[PDB]
């Protein structure tokens, strides 16, 4: 567990990692996956939730038997100019099925004009950087999340 919770760097939620701690959120369901999201998006790391994180990045089934842990890592994962190394998936043609990962970077075609692998005015890079800043409101600050399956 030390290699996970006490890890130096955490993964982005789109590229999440798979591998008595009771003594910010320790909600257990019916009773390890690593990534960083902002605090307001932690509620989507629960069964039956919707949103950009729950639908495009990390999806939990309603049949989930496990525990969702999280803590504020603003002190670690924020730079004063913004930490743009953490990203999430803004665009996707469908929602992920439970426990599915998407690390692709194909350009999202939002209009009739094909992209052919190039970002354009209506051709989006599908990942959006967080730009975590230490003075952001705590709901916008980064939270490390560990989901025990």
């Amino acid at each position: 567990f030390g290699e996970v919770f006490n890890a130096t760097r955490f993964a982005s939620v789109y590229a999440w990692n798979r591998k008595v701690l009771y003594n910010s959120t320790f909600k257990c369901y019916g009773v390890a996956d690593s990534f960083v999201i902002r605090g307001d998006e932690v509620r989507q790391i629960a069964p039956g939730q919707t949103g950009k994180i729950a639908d495009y990045n990390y999806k939990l089934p309603d049949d989930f038997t496990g525990c969702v842990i999280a803590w504020n890592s603003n002190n670690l994962d924020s730079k004063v100019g913004g930490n743009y190394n953490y990203l999430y998936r803004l665009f996707r043609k469908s929602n992920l099925k439970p426990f599915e990962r998407d690390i692709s970077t194909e350009i999202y075609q939002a209009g009739s004009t094909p992209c052919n692998g190039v970002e354009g005015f209506n051709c989006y890079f599908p990942l959006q950087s967080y730009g975590f800043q230490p003075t952001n409101g705590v709901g916008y600050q980064p939270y490390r999340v560990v989901v025990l399956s």
Partner: antibody
Amino acid sequence: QVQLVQSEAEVKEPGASVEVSCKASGYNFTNFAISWVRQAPGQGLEWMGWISGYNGDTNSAQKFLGRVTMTTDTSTTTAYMELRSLRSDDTAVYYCAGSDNYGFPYNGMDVWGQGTTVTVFN
Amino acid sequence: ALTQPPSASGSPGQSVTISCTGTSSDLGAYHFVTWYQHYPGKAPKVMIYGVRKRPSGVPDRFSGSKSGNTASLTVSGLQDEDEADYYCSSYAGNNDFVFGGGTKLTVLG
């Protein structure tokens, strides 16, 4: 990329309503998001709202919530913007702008109209 | 609304940077910062979209970037054709936009 054609200048009186047309000029608005942006004399650009010519998704700025109605007839490929109960500070140039997009134009608007001056006279 | 200086200026050839301050729910949250060039009378023209990308035909002397809640547009080698109003704008998070107040860019004569 100015290509949309808008209706002629309008002269209205306080409390009247106005409707500005914006004809696609050769495109088909079925694959176009449409936005409306106004500029009052001596002020900056002001986003009024947007409608999707694909599925009709609409959103309006909180300033104009309840006062504006945007529609599209892709039959004629024409966008329409109605502004109700004009005040004197509604005197502005009104632009329609578009982009090839079936959803929201996150990057903004690529294609523009020439503008339509609407004067609420005193 | 976003915040812009009223006036930015330089002599022909110099570099000018116009800053634009937003919040963590628009500028800080997205890479959908677009800069519009405007001359009252004509229609707005996109100069920079995304945050730093140039539509084709826009001179490479236009560049853009952002840091935290502050975006910026830099024009290198100022030319008289660049004198105009410039508006920063951003996706605001709920299928909407937020505009700055505009900045007049003057080629100092």
